[PDB]
Design a protein around this ligand. Sequence first.
Ligand code: CU
Ligand code: CU
Lengths: 128, 128
Amino acid sequence: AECSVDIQGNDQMQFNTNAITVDKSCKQFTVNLSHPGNLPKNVMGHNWVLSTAADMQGVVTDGMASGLDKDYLKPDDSRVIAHTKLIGSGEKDSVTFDVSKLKEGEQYMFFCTAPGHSALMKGTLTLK
Amino acid sequence: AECSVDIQGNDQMQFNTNAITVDKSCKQFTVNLSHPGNLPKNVMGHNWVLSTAADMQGVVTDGMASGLDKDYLKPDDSRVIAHTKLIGSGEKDSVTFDVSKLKEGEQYMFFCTAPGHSALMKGTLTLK
Ligand SMILES: [Cu+2]
Ligand SMILES: [Cu+2]
């Protein structure tokens, strides 16, 4: 609906969509992170980070060397715009960020940071 | 088959099984690693590593820290009783090993070492 998305993350390492379209009719955009499945955090754990595709891998790498204890995300990451916290199945989590934080025509991509989940748990965030 | 498992590494981190048996009536065993799935090595690579349940941790670990140009295994890993290579989309590779390396009543474990894969990609080797 209006200024929020209902995004999923399953047991298959599948986000529900690779497409997030953020209208300019906004100042705040919310991400409704959900996880159907029956797998715990330490197994099929998901998250949601935002950043320039340029920096993506920076997040990923750093995220990786920071453990589950740091939500597979370096403490205070200047590349991380928005970001949720890791979540297991039947769990939930939201994040809000300022639409003004996203500069016109730049590469925006979303993705889980849990080791080797990056790959196919990715997306493009388009500022409409 | 006899001696013999063909295991399956698909795309959604699911090795076909969770248990492999190695009858005592063998000096040597042989494992068939297929790879159903359109996804490249670097993306969703698979292997087959064998060790006590005791070293697993150390092996998933050191492995991870070693890179796709080292099939996420640590050169000459003494903990590793036998391993295949890391296979891309549809690729194939086998391992053949001396069953006499195995001591009954020990907990043996098989698994992939690709970053956050052993989560789901692990199982049981039973010297029957
Ligand atoms: Cu994930
Ligand atoms: Cu694997």
